[PDB]
Point group: D2
Chain length 327, copies 4
């Protein structure tokens, strides 16, 4: 049995005696992600560069990748009839779905993450988290302000050497490779579980001067292991989706701690940190800010940042025991 | 007008009043890079997973990506009738072309580079360097022991968010985007030059304990600038092709020095360091061991390794200055 | 609202307060049809012709298109958990789905129709009809012996200049174009209705010598209109799916009447005639054998043939009034 | 070895000790045919239908397939710098290349042929015929009024179940399959020859009332063979490119004679009849008006029409014999 993601979600829904909305919702995301992937890989770029004389559409229009990505997600998500509140990294306000198309899901998303890496063609991705609305009020921003602990599903699509969609739900984590030949996601790793302990550490050490004593100490340990074991390898792609995906698949740890330009860290809680934390923990990993569990923070700003440290349970706890020691 | 690599290469050939072997070799490489790209993006992977039954080999009998890539490159290059000796990272010995397919060119390639990043879907790529044969005598592995300085052409294909072929010839570096919808590389940047000074450093800091004192000092400057300027950001994909390309386009520096565990460095002179060193110098940047230009090393072994430091000229110059100050 | 076929079927199922099986079933067919289309358009054919030296799979294997098509459908259909009996044109016996994977639907199909046209690259297609099982007995052949009047859904995918999936159900007929860039079928014509009267007639007139008086007379009329109107244009592609699709879209009429090599006509009732008749009639057209309604014939052999005349209501009735006149 | 059209064309050029303009023109055509093929198969059609919002023009402002095709062909051909005069079915007047892009070649093309079949998804295609300029004098429309006999190259791309480019040059006809996964046409049949005698006839019998007595008699022979052999099958896609290709590969005959409503026939001499006549004769078949070779007509108008009868030599010879018997 080849498992497609379309089959997988539908079977999931039929297990849960669902109304379907979530199936429709996840089918929408899949469509959006294939469309984003096709654009990310620059399909049709000959037309931008004049293969048919320009002409074509009459008056100036063209989109950056990030704008298209955002358009696809929002339109695809609305079309689902499964959502009521959308939080995109690109919209300073929560988007409230028009009643006609209103469903019960709230969706926080980064349509295209890793923007520093777009122009150099490095891996970038799409990140999403989904809540059920838990109010009877008019859907509004407040419905997106839930701790990540309430996520019913989250994951990301990585547009890398190949395109992979990682979906996490209450039961666990599954990876589906996009076969772009047939536009189908194929389950290739069922019930993914991160190694307890890794040998890779991923952080932007350019901020060394701004790190707290606890990060600084952990980093020296990765380099000069006190047990005089082999030092960890370093990897930082610079696109959270690639770096997090490699953490998931090879183990190790990823850090975006606080530093002065952000004391609250850089990464956004609702649509960067939370969905990654939910995937990590569903895979048997950890995601802490250094002081508290990421998924337990009750947000009060849909764009608030959080520091995040995530990955293998014994790497992350080793760091957390360092914070615990210094405090 | 839109410029395709096929047209470009062909005009370059016509200008030259060459015989056309170079042209045939490069159309060859293009065809191979597109065929590696489609396989890297995992097209038709659903057949591997049983979409059409025939379900026994969900394990490893079917070709790894590196073996397929190597086959594609060796085979396409042989059929161009333009080469006589080939050096692949994947074969212990130089391959000598059967006389019937013998051209005048020598090709040193890494069919898929970035192997540690293959399982996690991070960017990977293809690196080639092309020599004219110097000798009259029967072609042999010695024919490929020429300093990169003697390169007639070199470049790489990056299979990243999109696929890009970067080609550097005598008169400069050009970047061609692959539009996979029509199987055509489009000139997107012409006469590429790296910027004088970057703000990014790329090196695997996990080897901190093994770095010589100049690498050590230089890294300290990137994090704690003595003159109090902004610290450099850090980036390290873990795939030379991705980190190089990011250096070309955004500026900064890429480092893989010798370390006490690897004394002569890790990266292979003929089909990793030279081609990239050549690209870099053609783009106004530098590529050094820390003591001598990379392109000036006289290779004594086709699998010889070399330390390499490359990128913006002011950044590489600064570390060169550190090495001379350390004697 | 862009409508994908995945969304459309799911919304259909959620309207009908379904268990899902039919949604899972139609999602399976979609996947099969994209995979068939990708193969039909010869994606990967470079490998057949040695781009990477052969090698690849070790010992002889390769499939004809028709064999692959059949494999895809059967495996995809079984995987659905929605079927119990499958009738393929390629299997001399009905296929009884193993209990583990048994669903309640019976599916009759031509995985690849128009075989005379494959080697010359003309349009070919896939044809399907679906019944609910209407017995409590062990699923068996007899469950596939239902008149087409009991179909819950039928249609075809045409692999032509583009790939289109035409789905007919109790409510009517919808056309979805395959956008092979994202592997999604896009609803492009809702609730399709055939013109009452066409101006095209499609038949293999090479059998003129064997036609009954009624076909012969109608044909002379198409050529020499008794009202001295412009004669009908003639089109016969030779692949029922193309010819029928053009009948549906432009109107007119298609005939595969009885002749000596077949007195019962050539086309197979269960998986050629019936699904096409169901589409035609759902679009406001007709499908007769010349004497009786195609969809009312109770089959007794899963491979039995029927003569078929179909298309615009006034063309078909004009022919039927000719049969009525001669009898 | 695998032979790509790019390699083939390039070797053909090298052999010739040509300047390379022919080579550049044909790489040009290849690039255009792949770009028409991808658009014909409807890639990215979901953007036209609102997948990313921007929903106003679901009507006709965006480019018809024929206009896009024409733009692609004119533009790509101009940029090859190998042509001086172009004749497109879509432009009333010959197009004269601006001096800066002037080569030595004259191209007569039908960018998309098969227009009546475009809406129903039946096969369609691209037909080109390439002349050397005969004159010294400023290029003009007269430069394209040369008998097909003077053709240096001609062929067609069929966008059928798969896309195939058929190219006929002085030394014969070769068929190249497009593998759209890597954007590469693969030589699949070399030195193609049509069979002596076929069993298929292709003609639009709707004009029966307008056919001269020789066409009339010949058709009667196909259906009721005087010598009691098996009647010919009939086939008529309605797209010259598809019906021709089927004639090339399976043998038989294709007919578009003059009829009283169209006295000089329907098909255009320069960019429908000639190129196909040339292909046919290069493959050992014939192409006649019924009274003279098609390739020997001296065109007096770039949009001149001509009756054409083509295919297996014995089949065409037999109808020629009928015409001479009718005076
Ligand atoms: O350049 P920095 O500070 O290392 O930030 C990189 C981070 O920025 C982001 O693009 C912001 O989302 C993340 O993908 C990534 O991890
Ligand atoms: O794990 P490390 O030592 O940092 O290796 C990274 C290097 O490994 C390689 O894959 C070796 O070829 C390069 O692509 C890359 O630069
Ligand atoms: O060659 P003939 O007798 O005209 O038969 C053509 C018919 O054969 C089939 O391939 C048999 O399915 C149909 O697609 C088509 O209509
Ligand atoms: O409807 P008719 O007259 O049979 O026309 C068919 C001919 O029309 C054309 O489209 C005219 O270009 C050809 O492709 C085809 O052979
Ligand atoms: Mg973003
Ligand atoms: Mg982001
Ligand atoms: Mg390698
Ligand atoms: Mg390598
Ligand atoms: Mg079949
Ligand atoms: Mg059939
Ligand atoms: Mg045309
Ligand atoms: Mg035409």
């Amino acid at each position: 049995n080849i498992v497609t993601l379309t089959r997988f979600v539908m079977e999931e829904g039929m297990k849960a005696r669902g109304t379907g909305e979530m199936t429709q919702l996840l089918n929408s995301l899949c469509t959006a992600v294939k469309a984003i992937s096709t654009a990310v890989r620059k399909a049709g770029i000959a037309h931008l560069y004049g293969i048919a004389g320009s002409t074509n559409v009459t008056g100036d229009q063209v989109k950056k990748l990030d704008v298209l990505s955002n358009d696809l997600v929002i339109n695809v998500l609305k079309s689902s009839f499964a959502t009521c509140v959308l939080v995109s990294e690109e919209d300073k306000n929560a988007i409230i779905v028009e009643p006609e198309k209103r469903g019960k899901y709230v969706v926080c998303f980064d349509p295209l993450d890793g923007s520093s890496n777009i122009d150099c063609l490095v891996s970038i991705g799409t990140i999403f988290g989904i809540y059920r609305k838990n109010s009877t009020d008019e859907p509004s921003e407040k419905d997106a302000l839930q701790p990540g602990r309430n996520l019913v599903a989250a994951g990301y699509a990585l547009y890398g050497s190949a395109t992979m969609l990682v979906l996490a739900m209450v039961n666990g984590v599954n990876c589906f490779m996009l076969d772009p030949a047939i536009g189908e996601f194929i389950l290739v790793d069922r019930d993914v579980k991160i190694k307890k302990k890794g040998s890779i550490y991923s952080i932007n050490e350019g901020y060394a001067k701004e790190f707290d004593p606890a990060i600084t100490e952990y980093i020296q340990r990765k380099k000069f292991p006190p047990d005089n074991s082999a030092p960890y390898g370093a990897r930082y792609v610079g696109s959270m989706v690639a770096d997090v995906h490699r953490t998931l698949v090879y183990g190790g740890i990823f850090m975006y701690p606080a530093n002065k330009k952000s004391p609250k860290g850089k990464l956004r809680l609702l649509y960067e940190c939370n969905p990654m934390a939910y995937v990590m923990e569903k895979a048997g990993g950890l995601a802490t800010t250094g002081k508290e569990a990421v998924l337990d923070i009750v947000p009060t700003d849909i764009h608030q940042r959080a520091p995040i440290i995530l990955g293998s349970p014994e790497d992350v706890t080793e760091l957390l025991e360092i914070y615990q020691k210094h405090a």
